[PDB]
Structures are given as structure tokens and as C-alpha cells.
């Protein structure tokens, strides 16, 4: 994730009710009882009616585009090969072929039909996570569900997808002792772990 906090509201004398904006995991909680020191000491002249509305939503990191795990539901598909035959006196063909037992590949001069192989062990499991080059046959929980801290706390369909699922357990707390800031209490990602408490 990146808790890209929108800048909180500070009403000086009285309440500012928050609304549940549609941002992913839009955590927002009104707070009173502040006295926000901002560059001149405090600035709101009340002392309890000083209101502070903190809001924070979850958003894809900039690394999400590039450094990102990637789940998959994996079926069986169809296997391939760049079969060389330095045939007979032909002495050469290096052709890409299939396995399904009626496909020819007339590259060179020979027509060749391969498979289907009997050894249907797809080393990929049904559910797979993928990361850069290291591929993990992991039972990823699902889109839309991943427990915060666990893998897939952020779950975006793709990189472009503005919608997502962010169970991060993002819980705002009130800022301390009349100062402007935004306590965001949050699990570091299940993408942070899964990079150093992962599987092989």
C-alpha cells in the first residue's frame, strides 16, 4: 500500500462530520479536543471545540506498477518446444512446435506431429502467485478478501484498476497534544512480508 493521507480538516470551533468517501479503504474519523500547534503556536482560538477530521485511504504504490506480486488461477494449457532436427542429410531444422497430437509444423521440409504427452504434471498448482521472476505456487486467498498483514492486503485487479480491495486494518488515531499530524495505524503490507518471510 501507500497510506497517501489526504490532508486533514481542522475546524476551529465546532464539529465537522465526516462522510465515507468511495476511496479504497477510506478510513476517516472525526476528532475533537485539539489545539493544533502550527507555526504560531496553536491557531484555532477555541480549546475543545477545536475539531480535527483525519482521513486516509489506501492507494497503490508507485512500485505497484513495477514491483508487484501477481496472482493467477492456472489451468493446464498447451506445451511447446523449439525442436531441432539435424535430419538425415537435411542436417537442419530448428522449429517451434506444439504437443497436441495433430499439429504439424512444416518448418524445414519434414512434417512432424508430437504428443499429447502422458505426463500431465503441470508443476504450476491451480493457484499461483508470481513476482518478477520468482514464481510461487501459493494459495493466494482471493481478490476482495485478503486479511490485513497477510498476503494480498492490497488487491487490485490490474495496475490501471483504480478500484481495489484494501483490508489493511487502517485505523486512524487522534493526533497528540494539540499538534497537526495524522496517526495512521496500519499493518505494513503483506507484500512487505512475502518478500522476507515468504516461501521458496
Amino acid at each position: 500500500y501507500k497510506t497517501k493521507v489526504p490532508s486533514p480538516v481542522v475546524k476551529c470551533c465546532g464539529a465537522t462530520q465526516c462522510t465515507s468517501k468511495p476511496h479504497p479503504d477510506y478510513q476517516c474519523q472525526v476528532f475533537t479536543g485539539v489545539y493544533p500547534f502550527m507555526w504560531g503556536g496553536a491557531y484555532c482560538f477555541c480549546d475543545t471545540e477545536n475539531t480535527q477530521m483525519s482521513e486516509a485511504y489506501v492507494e497503490r504504490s508507485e512500485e505497484c506498477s513495477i514491483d508487484h506480486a501477481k496472482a493467477y488461477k492456472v489451468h493446464t494449457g498447451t506445451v511447446q518446444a523449439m525442436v531441432n532436427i539435424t535430419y538425415g542429410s537435411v542436417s537442419w531444422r530448428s522449429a517451434d512446435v506444439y504437443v497436441n497430437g495433430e499439429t504439424p509444423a512444416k518448418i524445414g521440409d519434414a512434417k512432424l506431429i508430437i504428443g499429447p504427452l502422458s505426463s500431465a504434471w503441470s508443476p504450476f498448482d491451480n493457484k499461483v502467485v508470481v513476482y518478477g521472476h520468482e514464481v510461487y505456487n501459493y494459495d493466494f486467498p482471493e481478490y476482495g478478501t485478503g486479511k490485513a498483514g497477510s498476503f494480498g492486503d492490497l488487491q487490485s485487479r490490474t495496475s490501471t484498476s483504480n478500484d481495489l480491495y484494501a483490508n489493511t486494518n487502517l485505523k486512524l488515531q487522534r493526533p497528540q497534544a494539540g499538534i497537526v499530524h495524522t496517526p495512521f495505524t496500519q499493518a505494513p503490507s503483506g507484500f512487505e512480508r512475502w518478500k522476507r518471510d515468504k516461501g521458496a
Binding site: 489526504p6 486533514p8 480538516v9 481542522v10 500547534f37 504560531g40 477530521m53 483525519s54 497537526v180 521458496a200
Partner: protein, 342 residues
């Protein structure tokens, strides 16, 4: 072409926020550190100060230095920047509010320049590490070794891969304004800026004015010293008070995108291969903790994983068809162990 991101430069100002342990304690530093990102691999962190260094107020020289002093900027030279952590970091580049710097690991992050009269630093908590990409768990990038696809931030500015919202500032306090008109509390204005004013007593209730007086109240400590000065937008820090009026425009890029650089990267010393009957003894002796692992290529995989930092003679029951062997990010080996028992 340092003149291609006047999106930020002209239109954004050096924001000032509340640093958490600003030398003594919580000050309000212009270089207040938000969004520490020790998430790459190359010894690098991308940081945002609330201060917008780069060009000056107007048009010149990335390598100058504009923070906020007063309500005002101070667009001057960068002379003695210091990012640091457990050790002093190395700057990489600055653009906008944002700096990239090569740091070691550190429990915290600790930033600061030197204006010249004062140290005037800012410091923050953030868990930092630098694993290099590879099965070697170094603490630091070497001079040599294989290159392989790390995650890392750029040197450059000509960058659009993302953009963060940067709309207006809210007001700010400035009780330097609220002087006294020899019996009454006297507000003034920066340059005709919009000062939002009233006191606990009943007097002028909005304040959109030049320098006003205050008929009713007298004490400076019961009045609204405010600066609606939204001629330049800001970063939308959590340590910003909202500009209550509107979501003004000011969508503004990020320079330091995470990119797929191939870091100059790790390599673990070669193994000592030793033969036995369908068995690899391997006296082994790394530089750093190295994740070794194998794959007995039977349909029985029987793999193994163990980080090795302490030199260790290990063993591997190799089968008839083969095994493979991965001494860190050194490439994977392979081995025929047919018979040797005659």
C-alpha cells in the same frame, strides 16, 4: 532541460509541517519528513521534505534551496544538506519536494541541511533495510558481481510515471501579524493576502482584508491569526490543515519513479565441489548469508533451503537423474550423479 517541470516549480511552495523529533522535540520544520520509502534495494531511499528545494522561487538551478522561513520562502544555495540514518547517507538527487539519497539501513531516518546560522534539521522514525536482489543477504552493494533485475529509483526528473495530488494549502497561523494598535490587537497582511480574522469577543467575523484593527478584543491570545495565501499549492501532507474551500487543481508528478534498474549486485564465493558416491559433499564458505537451495529433479522434488552465513560442509543425496545447485545468485549448477560404487 531542468525547465520541463514548472508544473511543480512555479506552482508549488516549500511546505512547512510538524517534524516529530526536531532536534529537541516536535518543532515545525519546513523539511518535515513524510513518506519515507526504504522499499527499493539499491541502498536508496526516496524522501519527501515538506520543503521544495530545486529551482529558486522563480527559474534557475536545481541545486539551489528554497524552504520556508516565516510565511516566506528562502530560495538560496543547498550548501550543506544532510540526510542520514544510522550512518550519514549519500544524496542522489533532488526534484521538487522530493529527494533521493543512498542510505544504509537504519531504524530511523534523520534529515537536515545547514542554513548557516543554525543546524535546523528534521528527523523521523522509519524501518529501513537494504536487501539486494539475490539469494545473498548482504548489508551493502559491492563493487562487482552479477547484474540482475533490482528495484530502484531514478536519478532524473523528466518523469511522469505517476503523479500525486497537490492542491492548495489551508490557512496557517502567524501571530507576528497580531500586533497591538496601542490598546487594540492589530492584524496586518503579507502582501494583500487573505487574513481570516475574529476574536473570542464579538468583532469582524470573516476577515478578507488589508491590515485591520480589532475594536472589541485586546489580547493577542484570543484571535484568529490566519493566512489564506493560496497563490501556490502544496503537497497534501497529513501534517497539513485542509483548505476548507475546495479541492483546487494542482495534479503534480513524482520524479523518482521506481524503475527496473539492474543493480550492480551480489555474488557469493564459489563452492568447493567434492565428489562422493551419489553424494555432493560441499565445503562451503560464503561472504554473507546466502540462501542455498536445490531441486532433486525426480518427480519427487525433495528440495532444500537454508540461508548460509557460517561456513559449512553440507551434503546432498543426489539421485541418478540429476540435481541442481544454486550458490546464491550465482547461476544454477547441475550434476550427473550416476553410480560410483563400481
Amino acid at each position: 532541460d531542468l525547465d520541463t517541470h514548472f508544473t511543480q516549480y512555479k506552482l508549488a511552495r516549500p511546505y512547512i509541517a510538524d517534524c516529530p523529533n526536531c532536534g529537541h522535540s516536535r518543532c515545525d520544520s519546513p523539511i518535515a519528513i513524510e513518506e519515507v520509502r526504504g522499499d527499493a534495494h539499491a541502498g536508496v531511499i526516496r524522501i519527501q521534505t515538506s520543503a521544495m528545494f530545486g529551482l529558486k522561487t522563480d527559474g534557475v538551478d536545481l541545486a539551489y534551496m528554497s524552504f520556508m522561513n516565516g510565511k516566506t520562502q528562502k530560495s538560496i544555495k543547498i550548501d550543506n544538506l544532510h540526510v542520514r540514518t544510522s550512518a550519514p547517507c549519500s544524496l542522489v538527487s533532488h526534484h521538487g519536494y522530493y529527494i533521493l539519497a543512498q542510505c544504509p539501513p537504519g531504524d530511523t531516518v534523520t534529515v537536515g541541511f545547514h542554513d548557516g546560522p543554525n543546524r535546523h534539521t528534521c528527523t523521523v522514525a522509519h524501518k529501513v533495510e537494504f536487501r539486494p536482489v539475490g539469494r545473498e543477504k548482504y548489508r551493502h552493494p559491492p563493487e562487482h558481481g552479477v547484474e540482475l533485475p533490482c528495484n530502484r529509483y531514478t536519478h532524473k526528473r523528466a518523469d511522469q510515471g505517476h503523479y500525486v495530488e497537490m492542491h492548495q494549502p489551508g490557512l496557517v497561523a502567524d501571530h507576528s501579524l497580531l500586533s497591538i494598535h496601542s490598546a487594540k490587537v492589530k492584524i496586518t497582511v503579507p502582501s494583500g493576502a487573505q487574513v481570516k480574522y475574529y476574536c473570542k469577543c464579538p468583532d469582524v467575523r470573516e476577515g478578507i482584508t488589508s491590515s485591520d484593527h480589532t475594536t472589541t478584543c485586546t489580547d493577542v491570545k484570543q484571535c484568529r491569526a490566519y493566512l489564506i495565501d493560496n497563490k501556490k499549492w502544496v503537497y497534501n501532507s497529513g501534517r497539513l490543515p485542509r483548505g476548507e474551500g475546495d479541492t483546487f487543481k494542482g495534479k503534480l508528478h513524482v520524479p523518482f519513479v521506481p524503475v527496473k534498474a539492474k543493480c550492480i549486485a551480489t555474488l557469493a564465493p564459489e563452492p568447493l565441489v567434492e565428489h562422493k558416491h551419489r553424494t555432493l559433499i560441499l565445503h562451503l564458505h560464503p561472504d554473507h548469508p546466502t540462501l542455498l537451495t536445490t531441486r532433486s529433479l525426480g518427480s519427487d522434488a525433495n528440495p532444500t533451503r537454508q540461508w548460509i552465513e557460517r561456513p559449512t560442509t553440507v551434503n546432498f543425496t543426489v539421485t541418478g537423474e540429476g540435481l541442481e545447485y544454486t550458490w546464491g545468485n550465482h547461476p544454477p549448477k547441475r550434476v550427473w550423479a550416476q553410480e560410483s560404487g563400481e
